[PDB]
Short mmCIF file of C-alpha atoms and ligand atoms in Angstrom, two decimals:
data_model
loop_
_atom_site.label_atom_id
_atom_site.label_comp_id
_atom_site.label_asym_id
_atom_site.label_seq_id
_atom_site.Cartn_x
_atom_site.Cartn_y
_atom_site.Cartn_z
CA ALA H 1 206.85 -137.54 -32.08
CA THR H 2 204.21 -140.20 -32.02
CA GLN H 3 202.00 -139.84 -35.22
CA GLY H 4 198.55 -141.35 -36.51
CA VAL H 5 197.15 -141.94 -32.91
CA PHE H 6 194.32 -140.28 -32.13
CA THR H 7 191.99 -140.26 -28.95
CA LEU H 8 188.17 -140.00 -29.76
CA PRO H 9 185.56 -139.92 -26.81
CA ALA H 10 184.40 -143.71 -25.99
CA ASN H 11 181.97 -145.60 -27.96
CA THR H 12 181.77 -143.03 -31.14
CA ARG H 13 180.84 -143.63 -34.47
CA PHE H 14 183.58 -142.23 -36.78
CA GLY H 15 184.11 -142.14 -40.21
CA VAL H 16 187.67 -143.09 -41.97
CA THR H 17 188.23 -142.85 -45.66
CA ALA H 18 192.13 -143.35 -47.42
CA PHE H 19 192.89 -141.96 -50.50
CA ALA H 20 196.27 -142.69 -52.74
CA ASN H 21 198.81 -141.01 -54.67
CA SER H 22 201.51 -143.14 -55.25
CA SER H 23 203.04 -146.04 -58.14
CA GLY H 24 203.07 -148.35 -55.04
CA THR H 25 200.09 -149.95 -53.45
CA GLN H 26 199.13 -148.31 -50.11
CA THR H 27 198.18 -150.68 -47.60
CA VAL H 28 196.13 -148.65 -44.79
CA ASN H 29 195.18 -150.19 -41.41
CA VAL H 30 193.01 -148.92 -38.87
CA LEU H 31 193.07 -150.05 -35.51
CA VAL H 32 190.75 -149.59 -32.36
CA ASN H 33 192.19 -150.04 -29.07
CA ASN H 34 195.08 -151.74 -30.21
CA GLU H 35 193.35 -154.30 -32.72
CA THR H 36 192.49 -154.08 -36.40
CA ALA H 37 188.92 -152.72 -37.19
CA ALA H 38 189.59 -152.00 -40.71
CA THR H 39 192.19 -152.61 -43.71
CA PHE H 40 191.87 -150.76 -47.00
CA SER H 41 194.34 -151.46 -49.89
CA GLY H 42 194.45 -150.12 -53.26
CA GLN H 43 196.97 -148.28 -56.11
CA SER H 44 196.28 -144.89 -57.47
CA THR H 45 197.92 -141.90 -58.69
CA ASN H 46 194.72 -139.87 -59.03
CA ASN H 47 193.38 -139.73 -55.49
CA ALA H 48 191.32 -142.58 -56.00
CA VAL H 49 189.31 -143.56 -53.08
CA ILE H 50 190.49 -147.15 -51.58
CA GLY H 51 188.15 -147.46 -48.87
CA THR H 52 185.47 -145.97 -46.47
CA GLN H 53 183.90 -147.42 -43.68
CA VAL H 54 182.13 -146.15 -40.71
CA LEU H 55 183.97 -147.58 -37.37
CA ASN H 56 183.34 -147.17 -33.55
CA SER H 57 185.95 -146.17 -31.25
CA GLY H 58 185.03 -148.50 -28.54
CA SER H 59 185.71 -148.29 -24.57
CA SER H 60 188.70 -146.47 -25.18
CA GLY H 61 188.33 -144.31 -27.88
CA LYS H 62 192.19 -145.08 -29.26
CA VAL H 63 192.18 -145.23 -32.93
CA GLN H 64 195.77 -145.64 -34.67
CA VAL H 65 196.32 -145.50 -38.57
CA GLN H 66 199.01 -147.16 -40.06
CA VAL H 67 200.16 -147.17 -43.69
CA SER H 68 202.43 -149.42 -45.12
CA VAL H 69 203.68 -150.03 -49.14
CA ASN H 70 205.33 -153.73 -49.69
CA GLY H 71 205.43 -154.83 -46.33
CA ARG H 72 207.49 -151.21 -45.51
CA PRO H 73 205.90 -148.80 -43.01
CA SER H 74 205.56 -145.56 -44.53
CA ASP H 75 206.43 -142.38 -42.41
CA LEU H 76 203.36 -140.59 -40.91
CA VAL H 77 202.34 -136.68 -40.38
CA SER H 78 198.99 -136.09 -38.26
CA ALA H 79 196.80 -133.66 -36.87
CA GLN H 80 193.21 -133.28 -35.12
CA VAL H 81 191.35 -130.17 -36.42
CA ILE H 82 187.99 -129.00 -34.47
CA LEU H 83 185.68 -126.43 -36.34
CA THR H 84 183.22 -124.86 -34.13
CA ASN H 85 183.74 -126.62 -31.18
CA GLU H 86 182.18 -129.65 -32.51
CA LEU H 87 183.31 -130.60 -36.07
CA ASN H 88 186.10 -133.21 -35.98
CA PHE H 89 188.81 -133.89 -38.37
CA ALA H 90 191.99 -136.46 -38.05
CA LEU H 91 194.02 -136.17 -40.93
CA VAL H 92 196.80 -138.68 -41.86
CA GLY H 93 199.40 -138.17 -44.51
CA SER H 94 202.26 -140.75 -45.49
CA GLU H 95 205.52 -140.75 -47.60
CA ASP H 96 206.33 -144.07 -49.31
CA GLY H 97 209.36 -142.82 -50.69
CA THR H 98 211.82 -140.05 -51.51
CA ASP H 99 209.89 -137.02 -53.09
CA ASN H 100 208.18 -136.23 -49.80
CA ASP H 101 204.89 -135.17 -51.21
CA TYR H 102 203.32 -137.21 -48.09
CA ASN H 103 199.83 -137.72 -49.98
CA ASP H 104 201.06 -141.68 -51.08
CA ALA H 105 198.00 -142.18 -48.88
CA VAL H 106 195.66 -139.81 -47.13
CA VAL H 107 193.38 -140.66 -44.61
CA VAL H 108 190.73 -138.50 -43.39
CA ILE H 109 188.34 -139.18 -40.07
CA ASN H 110 185.70 -137.27 -39.32
CA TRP H 111 183.21 -137.57 -36.75
CA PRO H 112 180.53 -136.81 -34.97
CA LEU H 113 178.21 -138.37 -37.80
CA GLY H 114 174.54 -138.46 -37.99
CA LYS J 1 214.42 -131.26 -15.10
CA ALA J 2 218.57 -131.59 -15.97
CA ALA J 3 219.28 -134.72 -13.94
CA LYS J 4 220.94 -138.21 -14.39
CA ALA J 5 217.63 -139.40 -13.48
CA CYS J 6 215.98 -137.22 -16.40
CA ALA K 1 183.46 -114.11 -42.02
CA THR K 2 183.39 -115.81 -45.54
CA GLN K 3 183.61 -119.69 -45.38
CA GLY K 4 184.29 -122.15 -47.63
CA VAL K 5 186.89 -120.35 -49.99
CA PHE K 6 190.45 -121.24 -50.29
CA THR K 7 193.31 -120.17 -52.41
CA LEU K 8 195.03 -122.99 -53.97
CA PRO K 9 198.44 -123.06 -55.74
CA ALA K 10 197.50 -122.19 -59.57
CA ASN K 11 196.85 -125.00 -62.11
CA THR K 12 197.63 -127.62 -59.06
CA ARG K 13 195.03 -130.89 -59.53
CA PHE K 14 193.02 -131.43 -56.00
CA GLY K 15 190.66 -133.83 -54.79
CA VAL K 16 187.41 -133.06 -53.39
CA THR K 17 185.08 -135.50 -51.86
CA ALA K 18 181.58 -135.06 -49.77
CA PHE K 19 180.25 -136.85 -47.16
CA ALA K 20 176.43 -136.37 -45.87
CA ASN K 21 175.13 -136.70 -42.44
CA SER K 22 171.51 -135.49 -42.29
CA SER K 23 167.86 -136.36 -43.41
CA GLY K 24 168.35 -133.25 -46.16
CA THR K 25 169.40 -133.91 -49.72
CA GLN K 26 173.01 -132.47 -49.69
CA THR K 27 174.02 -130.23 -53.00
CA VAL K 28 177.60 -129.42 -53.01
CA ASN K 29 178.83 -127.28 -55.28
CA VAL K 30 182.32 -126.81 -55.98
CA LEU K 31 183.88 -123.46 -58.20
CA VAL K 32 187.00 -122.81 -59.56
CA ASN K 33 187.54 -119.41 -60.87
CA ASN K 34 184.16 -118.73 -60.05
CA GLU K 35 182.42 -121.27 -62.37
CA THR K 36 180.77 -124.35 -61.53
CA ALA K 37 182.98 -127.25 -61.91
CA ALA K 38 181.59 -130.40 -59.96
CA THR K 39 178.26 -130.68 -58.24
CA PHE K 40 177.29 -133.35 -55.98
CA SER K 41 173.92 -134.38 -54.68
CA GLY K 42 173.19 -137.20 -51.96
CA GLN K 43 171.67 -137.84 -48.79
CA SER K 44 173.13 -140.26 -45.95
CA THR K 45 173.07 -140.14 -42.04
CA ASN K 46 175.92 -142.43 -42.08
CA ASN K 47 178.59 -140.67 -43.68
CA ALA K 48 178.36 -141.99 -47.23
CA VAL K 49 180.31 -140.55 -50.11
CA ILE K 50 177.84 -138.42 -51.97
CA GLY K 51 180.89 -137.46 -54.35
CA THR K 52 184.60 -137.53 -55.23
CA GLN K 53 186.75 -135.80 -57.90
CA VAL K 54 189.68 -134.68 -59.24
CA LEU K 55 189.65 -130.67 -60.32
CA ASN K 56 192.26 -128.50 -61.29
CA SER K 57 192.52 -125.32 -59.40
CA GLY K 58 193.09 -123.13 -62.64
CA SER K 59 194.51 -120.04 -63.22
CA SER K 60 193.21 -118.54 -60.49
CA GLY K 61 193.61 -121.16 -57.95
CA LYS K 62 190.46 -119.97 -56.42
CA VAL K 63 188.09 -123.02 -54.80
CA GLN K 64 184.90 -122.05 -53.34
CA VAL K 65 182.48 -124.63 -51.79
CA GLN K 66 178.43 -124.06 -51.67
CA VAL K 67 176.02 -126.37 -49.77
CA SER K 68 172.14 -126.11 -49.91
CA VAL K 69 169.68 -128.29 -48.89
CA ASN K 70 166.37 -128.10 -51.04
CA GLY K 71 167.51 -124.68 -52.15
CA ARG K 72 168.32 -123.01 -49.24
CA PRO K 73 172.07 -122.43 -48.37
CA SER K 74 173.45 -124.55 -44.94
CA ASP K 75 175.60 -122.13 -42.84
CA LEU K 76 179.47 -123.19 -43.36
CA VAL K 77 182.67 -123.54 -41.24
CA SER K 78 185.88 -124.17 -42.81
CA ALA K 79 189.38 -123.83 -42.53
CA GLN K 80 192.92 -125.09 -44.03
CA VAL K 81 195.44 -126.97 -42.42
CA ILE K 82 199.03 -127.51 -44.25
CA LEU K 83 201.12 -130.62 -42.90
CA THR K 84 204.87 -130.83 -43.07
CA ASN K 85 204.61 -127.73 -45.24
CA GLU K 86 203.63 -130.00 -48.15
CA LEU K 87 200.19 -131.70 -47.46
CA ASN K 88 197.21 -129.49 -47.97
CA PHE K 89 194.14 -129.84 -46.37
CA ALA K 90 190.93 -127.46 -46.76
CA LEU K 91 187.75 -128.82 -44.81
CA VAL K 92 184.33 -127.42 -44.85
CA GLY K 93 181.55 -128.53 -42.58
CA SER K 94 177.66 -127.61 -42.87
CA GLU K 95 174.48 -126.63 -41.26
CA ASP K 96 171.11 -127.19 -42.61
CA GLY K 97 169.08 -127.33 -39.70
CA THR K 98 169.17 -126.28 -35.73
CA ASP K 99 170.90 -129.15 -33.88
CA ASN K 100 174.46 -127.08 -35.10
CA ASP K 101 176.29 -130.68 -35.74
CA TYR K 102 177.52 -128.98 -38.67
CA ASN K 103 178.23 -132.84 -40.15
CA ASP K 104 175.28 -132.57 -42.78
CA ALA K 105 177.27 -132.09 -45.72
CA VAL K 106 180.95 -132.58 -44.85
CA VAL K 107 183.67 -131.61 -47.53
CA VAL K 108 187.40 -132.79 -47.43
CA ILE K 109 189.58 -130.91 -50.47
CA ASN K 110 193.43 -132.28 -50.69
CA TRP K 111 196.29 -131.62 -52.88
CA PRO K 112 198.95 -132.43 -53.85
CA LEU K 113 198.17 -135.30 -56.22
CA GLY K 114 199.80 -138.24 -57.77
CA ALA F 1 178.40 -120.61 -36.52
CA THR F 2 179.53 -119.88 -33.22
CA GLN F 3 183.45 -119.33 -32.85
CA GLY F 4 185.52 -118.38 -29.93
CA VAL F 5 184.16 -120.74 -27.95
CA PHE F 6 186.02 -124.31 -26.77
CA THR F 7 185.77 -127.05 -24.35
CA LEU F 8 188.81 -127.43 -22.63
CA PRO F 9 189.56 -130.88 -20.18
CA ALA F 10 188.55 -129.39 -16.62
CA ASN F 11 190.48 -128.18 -13.91
CA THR F 12 193.42 -127.64 -16.72
CA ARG F 13 195.82 -124.94 -16.89
CA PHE F 14 195.75 -123.14 -20.04
CA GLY F 15 197.75 -120.37 -21.51
CA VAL F 16 195.99 -117.23 -23.23
CA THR F 17 197.87 -114.25 -25.18
CA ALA F 18 196.10 -111.76 -27.31
CA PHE F 19 198.03 -109.72 -29.85
CA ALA F 20 196.80 -106.77 -31.85
CA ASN F 21 196.65 -105.34 -35.30
CA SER F 22 194.71 -102.31 -35.58
CA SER F 23 193.97 -98.83 -35.11
CA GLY F 24 191.10 -99.37 -32.85
CA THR F 25 191.62 -100.53 -28.85
CA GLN F 26 190.92 -104.17 -28.58
CA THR F 27 188.94 -105.40 -25.63
CA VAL F 28 189.79 -109.05 -25.07
CA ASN F 29 187.60 -110.85 -22.60
CA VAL F 30 188.17 -114.47 -21.64
CA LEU F 31 185.21 -116.67 -20.14
CA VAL F 32 185.36 -119.18 -18.19
CA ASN F 33 182.33 -121.46 -17.56
CA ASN F 34 180.86 -118.26 -18.68
CA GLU F 35 182.33 -115.59 -16.35
CA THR F 36 185.14 -113.66 -17.07
CA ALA F 37 188.48 -114.75 -15.98
CA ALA F 38 190.73 -112.32 -17.78
CA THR F 39 190.65 -108.82 -19.66
CA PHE F 40 193.04 -107.30 -21.93
CA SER F 41 192.83 -103.94 -23.24
CA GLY F 42 195.10 -102.50 -25.87
CA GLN F 43 195.84 -101.03 -29.26
CA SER F 44 199.38 -101.98 -31.85
CA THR F 45 199.15 -102.11 -35.40
CA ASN F 46 202.32 -103.99 -35.29
CA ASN F 47 201.14 -107.39 -33.32
CA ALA F 48 202.28 -106.08 -29.67
CA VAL F 49 201.16 -108.65 -27.24
CA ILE F 50 198.23 -106.80 -25.50
CA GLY F 51 198.03 -109.50 -22.57
CA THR F 52 199.06 -113.00 -21.61
CA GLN F 53 198.08 -114.93 -18.55
CA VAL F 54 197.54 -118.23 -17.23
CA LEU F 55 194.20 -119.36 -16.50
CA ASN F 56 192.53 -122.34 -15.25
CA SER F 57 189.33 -124.29 -17.20
CA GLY F 58 187.81 -124.73 -14.02
CA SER F 59 184.77 -127.14 -13.27
CA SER F 60 183.58 -127.34 -16.60
CA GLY F 61 186.36 -126.47 -19.07
CA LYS F 62 184.26 -123.95 -21.09
CA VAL F 63 186.08 -121.25 -22.46
CA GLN F 64 185.00 -118.53 -25.09
CA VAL F 65 187.03 -115.43 -26.37
CA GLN F 66 185.25 -112.26 -26.95
CA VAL F 67 186.36 -109.57 -28.74
CA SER F 68 185.22 -105.54 -29.05
CA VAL F 69 186.42 -102.15 -30.30
CA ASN F 70 184.56 -99.50 -28.65
CA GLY F 71 181.70 -101.58 -27.05
CA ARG F 72 181.42 -103.09 -30.95
CA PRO F 73 181.53 -106.80 -30.63
CA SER F 74 184.10 -107.96 -33.71
CA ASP F 75 183.58 -110.75 -36.43
CA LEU F 76 185.38 -113.73 -34.66
CA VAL F 77 186.69 -116.78 -36.61
CA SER F 78 188.14 -119.78 -34.71
CA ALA F 79 189.30 -123.12 -34.86
CA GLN F 80 191.20 -125.89 -32.46
CA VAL F 81 194.39 -128.04 -33.29
CA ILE F 82 195.95 -130.86 -31.79
CA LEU F 83 199.37 -132.00 -32.53
CA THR F 84 200.68 -135.35 -31.53
CA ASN F 85 197.54 -136.16 -29.89
CA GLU F 86 198.27 -133.99 -26.96
CA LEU F 87 199.25 -130.26 -27.45
CA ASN F 88 196.23 -128.18 -28.02
CA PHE F 89 195.82 -124.61 -29.56
CA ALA F 90 192.87 -122.79 -29.77
CA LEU F 91 192.72 -120.43 -32.01
CA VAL F 92 190.96 -117.06 -32.59
CA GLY F 93 190.69 -114.02 -34.84
CA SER F 94 188.77 -111.03 -35.19
CA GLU F 95 187.73 -108.23 -37.63
CA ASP F 96 186.82 -104.73 -36.19
CA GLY F 97 186.23 -103.29 -39.52
CA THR F 98 185.71 -103.68 -43.46
CA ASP F 99 189.21 -104.92 -44.29
CA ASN F 100 188.61 -108.38 -43.29
CA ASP F 101 191.95 -108.86 -42.37
CA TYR F 102 190.93 -110.89 -39.40
CA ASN F 103 194.13 -109.93 -37.22
CA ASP F 104 192.71 -106.94 -35.72
CA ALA F 105 192.89 -108.93 -32.31
CA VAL F 106 194.58 -112.46 -32.73
CA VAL F 107 194.30 -114.89 -29.74
CA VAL F 108 196.26 -118.00 -28.83
CA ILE F 109 195.22 -120.59 -26.63
CA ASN F 110 197.35 -123.22 -25.48
CA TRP F 111 197.51 -126.18 -22.95
CA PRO F 112 198.85 -128.19 -21.29
CA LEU F 113 201.48 -126.16 -19.26
CA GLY F 114 204.54 -126.73 -16.88
CA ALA Z 1 209.02 -135.72 -41.72
CA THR Z 2 210.73 -132.41 -41.62
CA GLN Z 3 208.77 -130.27 -38.92
CA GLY Z 4 208.96 -126.31 -37.80
CA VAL Z 5 209.87 -125.11 -41.73
CA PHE Z 6 206.80 -122.77 -43.19
CA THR Z 7 206.72 -121.35 -46.08
CA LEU Z 8 205.37 -117.97 -46.15
CA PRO Z 9 203.89 -115.50 -48.81
CA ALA Z 10 207.04 -113.75 -49.75
CA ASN Z 11 208.07 -110.29 -48.57
CA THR Z 12 205.56 -110.38 -45.65
CA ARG Z 13 205.87 -109.37 -42.45
CA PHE Z 14 205.10 -111.70 -39.75
CA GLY Z 15 204.73 -112.06 -35.63
CA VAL Z 16 207.00 -114.45 -33.96
CA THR Z 17 206.51 -115.39 -30.25
CA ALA Z 18 207.92 -118.46 -27.71
CA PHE Z 19 206.64 -119.68 -24.44
CA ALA Z 20 208.78 -121.90 -22.34
CA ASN Z 21 207.07 -124.81 -20.19
CA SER Z 22 210.45 -126.40 -19.39
CA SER Z 23 213.11 -126.33 -16.55
CA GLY Z 24 215.69 -126.23 -18.85
CA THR Z 25 216.32 -122.90 -20.57
CA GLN Z 26 214.80 -122.82 -24.25
CA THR Z 27 217.04 -121.45 -27.29
CA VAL Z 28 214.60 -120.60 -30.16
CA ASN Z 29 216.01 -119.89 -33.41
CA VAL Z 30 214.04 -118.38 -36.33
CA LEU Z 31 215.65 -118.67 -39.61
CA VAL Z 32 214.86 -116.79 -42.56
CA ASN Z 33 215.70 -118.00 -46.05
CA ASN Z 34 218.23 -120.50 -44.06
CA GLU Z 35 220.31 -117.64 -41.74
CA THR Z 36 219.08 -116.54 -38.67
CA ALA Z 37 217.00 -113.50 -37.99
CA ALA Z 38 215.58 -113.83 -34.46
CA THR Z 39 217.15 -115.73 -31.41
CA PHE Z 40 215.12 -116.32 -28.39
CA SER Z 41 216.43 -117.75 -24.72
CA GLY Z 42 214.56 -118.15 -21.26
CA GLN Z 43 213.54 -120.48 -18.70
CA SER Z 44 209.97 -120.44 -17.31
CA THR Z 45 207.67 -123.41 -16.09
CA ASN Z 46 204.28 -120.94 -16.66
CA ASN Z 47 203.89 -120.45 -20.18
CA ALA Z 48 205.89 -117.04 -19.99
CA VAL Z 49 206.78 -115.04 -23.05
CA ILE Z 50 210.49 -115.77 -23.47
CA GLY Z 51 210.36 -113.80 -26.94
CA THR Z 52 208.35 -111.85 -29.19
CA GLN Z 53 209.57 -110.35 -32.77
CA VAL Z 54 208.20 -108.88 -35.94
CA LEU Z 55 210.29 -110.20 -38.78
CA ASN Z 56 210.24 -110.27 -42.74
CA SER Z 57 209.53 -113.66 -44.58
CA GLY Z 58 212.01 -112.08 -47.21
CA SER Z 59 212.56 -113.23 -51.15
CA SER Z 60 212.25 -116.98 -50.55
CA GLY Z 61 209.20 -117.05 -47.66
CA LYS Z 62 211.09 -119.72 -46.26
CA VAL Z 63 211.14 -119.72 -42.10
CA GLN Z 64 212.45 -122.26 -39.88
CA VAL Z 65 212.24 -122.51 -36.22
CA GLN Z 66 214.48 -124.64 -34.32
CA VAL Z 67 214.63 -125.16 -30.39
CA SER Z 68 217.33 -126.43 -28.16
CA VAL Z 69 218.18 -127.08 -24.62
CA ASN Z 70 221.85 -127.46 -23.77
CA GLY Z 71 222.77 -128.40 -27.33
CA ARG Z 72 220.69 -130.77 -27.58
CA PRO Z 73 217.87 -130.17 -30.27
CA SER Z 74 214.12 -130.68 -28.76
CA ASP Z 75 211.76 -132.97 -30.69
CA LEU Z 76 209.35 -130.70 -33.06
CA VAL Z 77 205.93 -130.74 -34.07
CA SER Z 78 203.99 -128.21 -36.34
CA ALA Z 79 201.22 -127.77 -38.34
CA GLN Z 80 199.94 -124.41 -40.41
CA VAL Z 81 196.33 -123.50 -40.10
CA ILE Z 82 194.23 -120.58 -42.32
CA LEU Z 83 191.35 -119.27 -41.01
CA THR Z 84 188.70 -117.52 -43.73
CA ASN Z 85 191.38 -118.03 -46.42
CA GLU Z 86 193.32 -115.05 -44.87
CA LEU Z 87 194.82 -115.59 -41.13
CA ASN Z 88 197.32 -117.61 -41.19
CA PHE Z 89 199.11 -119.37 -38.02
CA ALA Z 90 202.34 -121.56 -37.88
CA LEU Z 91 202.64 -123.79 -34.86
CA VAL Z 92 205.20 -125.38 -33.20
CA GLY Z 93 205.47 -127.32 -30.10
CA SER Z 94 208.88 -129.00 -28.70
CA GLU Z 95 209.96 -131.89 -26.43
CA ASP Z 96 213.21 -131.47 -24.48
CA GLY Z 97 212.83 -134.48 -22.24
CA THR Z 98 210.95 -137.73 -21.58
CA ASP Z 99 207.28 -136.39 -20.69
CA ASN Z 100 206.18 -136.00 -24.05
CA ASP Z 101 204.08 -132.48 -23.34
CA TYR Z 102 205.49 -130.79 -26.01
CA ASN Z 103 205.15 -127.80 -24.70
CA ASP Z 104 208.83 -127.23 -23.41
CA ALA Z 105 208.85 -124.14 -26.12
CA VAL Z 106 206.01 -123.01 -28.07
CA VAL Z 107 206.44 -120.98 -31.35
CA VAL Z 108 203.68 -119.31 -32.45
CA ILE Z 109 204.04 -117.40 -35.94
CA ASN Z 110 200.91 -115.13 -37.29
CA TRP Z 111 200.34 -113.23 -40.29
CA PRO Z 112 199.20 -110.94 -41.93
CA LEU Z 113 200.07 -107.94 -39.43
CA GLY Z 114 198.85 -104.49 -39.55
C1 ZDC R 201 204.23 -141.39 -58.62
C2 ZDC R 201 205.33 -141.61 -57.49
O1 ZDC R 201 205.06 -143.04 -56.70
C3 ZDC R 201 205.58 -142.92 -55.42
C4 ZDC R 201 207.55 -143.38 -56.06
C5 ZDC R 201 207.83 -144.22 -57.03
O2 ZDC R 201 207.28 -145.54 -56.79
C6 ZDC R 201 205.60 -141.84 -54.75
O3 ZDC R 201 206.28 -141.75 -53.32
C7 ZDC R 201 205.32 -140.37 -55.16
O4 ZDC R 201 205.28 -139.44 -54.43
C8 ZDC R 201 204.89 -140.55 -56.80
O5 ZDC R 201 203.18 -140.66 -55.99
C1 ZDC R 202 209.53 -129.14 -15.60
C2 ZDC R 202 209.65 -130.18 -16.53
O1 ZDC R 202 211.22 -129.71 -17.39
C3 ZDC R 202 211.63 -130.61 -18.07
C4 ZDC R 202 212.25 -131.64 -17.86
C5 ZDC R 202 213.62 -131.15 -16.90
O2 ZDC R 202 214.04 -130.22 -17.46
C6 ZDC R 202 210.30 -130.43 -19.15
O3 ZDC R 202 210.57 -131.43 -20.22
C7 ZDC R 202 209.12 -131.28 -18.09
O4 ZDC R 202 208.08 -131.14 -19.48
C8 ZDC R 202 208.59 -130.17 -17.27
O5 ZDC R 202 207.93 -128.84 -17.89
C1 ZDC R 203 169.33 -136.46 -39.09
C2 ZDC R 203 169.31 -135.42 -38.85
O1 ZDC R 203 169.21 -134.67 -40.29
C3 ZDC R 203 169.20 -133.11 -40.32
C4 ZDC R 203 167.52 -132.39 -39.55
C5 ZDC R 203 166.47 -133.21 -40.09
O2 ZDC R 203 166.31 -133.11 -41.29
C6 ZDC R 203 170.35 -132.68 -39.36
O3 ZDC R 203 170.45 -131.09 -39.36
C7 ZDC R 203 170.56 -133.15 -38.30
O4 ZDC R 203 172.27 -132.92 -37.73
C8 ZDC R 203 170.60 -135.03 -38.31
O5 ZDC R 203 171.68 -135.18 -39.24
C1 ZDC R 204 195.15 -100.22 -39.17
C2 ZDC R 204 193.75 -100.38 -39.50
O1 ZDC R 204 192.95 -100.31 -38.17
C3 ZDC R 204 191.58 -100.97 -38.40
C4 ZDC R 204 190.72 -100.03 -39.44
C5 ZDC R 204 190.93 -98.48 -39.25
O2 ZDC R 204 190.58 -98.15 -37.85
C6 ZDC R 204 191.76 -102.56 -38.88
O3 ZDC R 204 190.53 -102.59 -39.20
C7 ZDC R 204 192.28 -102.59 -40.41
O4 ZDC R 204 192.75 -103.78 -40.18
C8 ZDC R 204 193.78 -102.38 -39.84
O5 ZDC R 204 194.37 -102.64 -38.94
CA1 CA R 205 205.86 -139.62 -51.95
CA1 CA R 206 202.43 -139.24 -54.23
CA1 CA R 207 173.05 -130.63 -38.77
CA1 CA R 208 173.85 -134.17 -39.07
CA1 CA R 209 190.62 -105.55 -39.80
CA1 CA R 210 194.13 -105.05 -39.19
CA1 CA R 211 208.48 -131.86 -21.79
CA1 CA R 212 206.93 -129.26 -19.99
#
């Protein structure tokens, strides 16, 4: 099934934050309405924040996370969780190799903000 | 539905 | 029900990251084995990261997130979600007032690391 | 925080299923747009299905689960989870006593159907 | 990534329940420690329960859900969610055709029981 794609309400401010846990440099692309809106890149095996940014979901509300490592797309896992019918998390993990820890790039999207 | 069309 | 308490696997490194979305200054305390292991303090209405740290879940694995504003405990909501039976997120939202957006301090705990 | 309340898309069919794990008889009321649409009453200490039904979210999509035992409202916990941006689960647990297993009535809402 | 595989606490009773939303007859296999412990078969386009059972996670805690239609494995989506650090849901959706509603068999695993 498709992973890393989330429908947000239109024109909504949301946070996106990426962490790295791999010897390979992680490239995280965040697309809004099929266009690149943010790109994070960094290397860490200690969960360093490689990027954090506030974006807007635009007229379509379509947000997509893509992760690649040295040009190779990583395998993604994702889910959305809603607490008290209000607080939203869109969560992404990714695997760039064979150990299947799925933390090589971890991406957290959260809304509402403010 | 199980069918050639599907 | 109790919120903000999570049983992690023992002796496991985890990330804890706090975001702020409120006029109030958020004090986020992270307890491991019922003992204070990290304290964040910050204010933002734009999802700023007010703290991010790598901790060890220790011998008990018990991790607890407390949030207060000016000494008053915020109301917490939390859950844990696991993707592909491997990637773990422990999620906390909190409300310091009466609008019930539950984003005033948002805390994300993730493991495994590395 | 409020628990057991979920906003669904309007005019959408959803499944609601209740399981019992308690000596107390569980009364589960499922409200759609603030009016009861289904009521289940059963007792089991081994996860018996005490009710299952297809409902329609109606004009406004508001769905609320209430649980009571002998007229006493139980303490609720809840969350919503979305898989592949399409498959939705709304989850409710409830505690009627002091052991805090939160399984005394378990309610699972799922959509889309068909 | 692998879907439909969950590590439960060892030697723990859990409920497993399957719902059907498809023209095709769904076959749901539930494995514990790599051996079949339950099999459900049924057909419904109305979210009917095609099976519900109480199982024991055994010494390994490994539980796997498989879904197939006419010998063809369905595409699975899954996640585990924990509420108040106690109530666990292991959730599976599945797609047997072309429309990506992922509800053709829906499997809910819940614990603790009693
Ligand atoms: C240090 C390792 O880096 C990768 C492999 C090499 O490279 C990741 O896939 C592993 O999970 C781990 O973080
Ligand atoms: C009635 C249909 O049955 C299937 C297709 C044929 O078979 C499912 O995939 C569809 O989602 C729908 O439920
Ligand atoms: C800017 C506001 O700050 C608080 C109330 C005042 O202060 C928060 O509770 C609100 O949700 C909002 O973020
Ligand atoms: C059998 C027991 O029934 C209740 C208490 C008595 O009654 C529940 O709260 C417990 O969790 C347990 O299921
Ligand atoms: Ca890896
Ligand atoms: Ca890794
Ligand atoms: Ca608030
Ligand atoms: Ca706020
Ligand atoms: Ca109880
Ligand atoms: Ca119980
Ligand atoms: Ca289908
Ligand atoms: Ca279907």
